Symmetry: C4
Subunit: 274 residues, 4 copies
């Protein structure tokens, strides 16, 4: 039905945030999720829209996103609560014709606003649109526990971290052959960290924020969730292995190459060279 | 409806205790939770109140709580069971006009009584009311697994423990800039441990009971739950990192300072100085 | 209603087995649970009983259990499935007037039989009835993960293991002041292991089977489940602490004594003396 | 009802994949599951079949499977989603009269195809049919976390790995007396890895794919799931024990022998000889 809460995208946002909550990745208001929609997705639900949509400026002009609708998680909102009250915890926003701000068409009730990591999200969407010719539609951030733990013990280096994650589950090279970008620790909720993330997103579908968490990009909620879940699963395996004293054996470079060849992916050169 | 079990506060108590049970923080009757209400919250439900409310004296006079209603978990009751029978496992109590005792207006059926940690709860409520000008409304105690584990291995010192928890997830300094108070081990269920906790609550929103668990205070169930969840998430990360041999790198003092500045919080000086 | 599946005891058996499944304690058919009932419990449901109750001899005469009804889990049945088909996975049995065998009054459909650990259960029930003047009504066995892990690393000694478990969560001494009996490894499903367990049950409410699991006894399903959950929670804490390099500090003997005094329990002397 | 989604086998596939998802064994599209059916199982549901069943060739002729129906998971489909849309994520396929290909009778909607590990599944089904005189009906693959972790630290040797898993939970020798076959790392989704797996399946009901996961075979979904769950539980125990510094004591060869004798199983000689 044209009850917007039963739409594919609201249901999808509930599923993703709820699943991430259950994984233990999103304590308190940790994490944020944005999904780029088409006008066609939200048009049937216009009757559900706020009669008086609030306007909020963006942090900087984002003309590439002009007229683009998104569904987003709210600032300070808990992933745990999305399923209980989607309208309180999520919003549908539509960027205005000059990419200078957006209207909140639905949700974010009681003066709520989009995620404080909106710069990281929207700037990353922009770079991912360019990088994938508009295929990618989702940016997801969560506090993936084992990935976080690894940032205290592994070299915070794209090649090293990528190579370890590839080694920690066979599928990883196939799921993220472009590897995992790593930033230095940076203050969250800033345009600095947002553009730095967006820059890494030019080269990688996953970006790590040391001592904090991960960002993932992909074409759908499931693909993006599954991308992060894959990297976090590998991280979980690695944490066990390291806790047991380290690898006695592992996936070799030659094996990774053979895997890349079979699946028609080009593995990140730097990570492979290790 | 004026079915009191469907009230925001009974539903909130069910959500919090159930979530804590699922987290593995509340084996058996471990843990307790009290929420300060307004008369306005319970007034519509007077028809639901016991016809003959039982009276129980408090451990000591608490005049600051005179005429104040609370919803509380019962002594020896299991968090796991709250969702199955809220009236058996929870009670609404109203402190009398002199703060010498309370009436059990609803729940705690079959001669049940409030939590044996009522001194810790109510005395902490008193100090938190003073410390936050009446903003804080919740005291929550649970057996947060990783926090407990850390009390056997980290120095049981407010500065040291706070600093480590801040390091273990970026959000921590922002969520608890006042840090985490630590008591010596003390016998549970006593007014000694209750006042000692209340005293720490003057300076901190989180207090650790070594080899036992944690107390948290906050304005709402979600904020208080989320506070503990944040500290426990950091603890979980730390336990992994320590199990892997310790930190190769971490969040620096300079980073913590920058984080504090950005979020307009004053980090506990002692923890920052380390 | 007189639908026996909605009885307190069938519902209780479902809750306990399901909770244990979710805890990860009961892979495959691992674990078994028996609850001693009164005639008064099952009498209203006689219409639900098999028209033709099957008779099975006991392994040895158990005259103390003459005419006693129990609800039990089935041999080779999965805890995971109890909630899906209680009649397939559980049975109500009534021991005959000489304690030589029992009739299967309800459940254990398709030729199912009670748990292969029936000797351990019924013999333990006998000793616990004697030891607690008929208060205890439940024997529960599960493959409590951390408790199992500890049996490979701690001395398999009642005093040592008890003392460590007491140290691993403050509540433990209060919950099991009589401590935890430990057997040598023995072949499961035998009367040898059953009587050995029953003998330990004379002195302890918890008994460990090294490299296998735990048995607990108590007056109700919740109290027995909670007993095991408490010991397993302490074990979980200990496994973390040991994985981090061991205790830097812990609950002292003097603290345990003070705790025992406050709660009016007599802690196992041998464990305290360590 | 003749709603095929409510059939025992569709419900069973949902239960197994959902349970495996909840165990954390099947991130993204990790894992695959195939169940051999009888014509009698699917015949009542012919009205539910695609009007126009798609035909797909097999990788190689499999005449032993001629005319045999299976229910299978789809390639790139998520275990997490099976419960949400069984027809999207599962299919019923029937191998043609020469074993050269199959028709997709139901499910795998929107051009979906069976699992990319179909060679491993069907070739293993063939060997297991031969090895168990048609008793085995299920092949299940998942990314069992602790089993995976162990492949980085234990010798990737059938005898060594089997013996350790037997030691890690008492039931293991009884559940898999034939032990656990181990392959070298191989490229997934190939007929090479499929036949290599099928060859190991001649001698073992469990086969490990280092740095990747496990395959299990059994007569029913529950028995096969429970087989993997048992091995993974033992692995979980072992990972804890190894993280704590290793075994101080364990199940002895003499104990394993006694266990084998009692349960009438012949333990894998090589593993016992260690
Ligand atoms: Zn974050
Ligand atoms: Zn409109
Ligand atoms: Zn407590
Ligand atoms: Zn009234
Ligand atoms: Zn057992
Ligand atoms: Zn009758
Ligand atoms: Zn796989
Ligand atoms: Zn037809």
């Amino acid at each position: 039905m044209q009850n917007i809460t039963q739409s594919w995208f609201v249901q999808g946002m509930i599923k993703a945030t709820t699943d991430a909550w259950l994984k233990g990745w999103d304590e308190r208001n940790g994490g944020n999720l944005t999904l780029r929609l088409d006008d066609a997705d939200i048009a049937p639900y216009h009757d559900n829209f706020h009669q008086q949509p609030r306007y909020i400026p963006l942090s900087q002009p984002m003309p590439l996103l002009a007229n683009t609708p998104f569904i987003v998680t709210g600032s300070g909102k808990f992933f745990r609560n999305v399923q209980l009250d989607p309208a309180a915890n999520l919003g549908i926003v539509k960027v205005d014709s000059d990419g200078a701000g957006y209207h909140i068409l639905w949700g974010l009730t009681n003066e709520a606003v989009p995620t404080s990591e909106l710069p990281a999200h929207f700037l990353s969407h922009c770079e991912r649109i360019k990088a994938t010719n508009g295929k990618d539609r989702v940016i997801m951030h969560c506090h993936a526990t084992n990935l976080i733990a690894l940032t205290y013990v592994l070299e915070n280096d794209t090649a090293v971290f990528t190579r370890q994650l590839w080694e920690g589950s066979t599928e990883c090279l196939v799921v993220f052959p472009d590897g995992v970008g790593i930033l230095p620790w940076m203050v969250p909720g800033t345009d600095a960290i947002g553009q730095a993330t967006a820059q890494e997103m030019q080269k990688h579908s996953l970006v790590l924020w040391p001592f904090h968490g991960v960002f993932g990009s992909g074409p759908t909620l499931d693909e993006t969730f599954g991308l992060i879940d894959t990297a976090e699963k590998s991280a979980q395996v690695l944490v066990k292995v390291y806790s047991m004293g380290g690898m006695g054996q592992t996936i070799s470079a030659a094996e990774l190459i053979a895997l890349g060849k079979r699946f028609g992916v080009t593995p990140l050169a730097s990570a492979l060279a290790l």
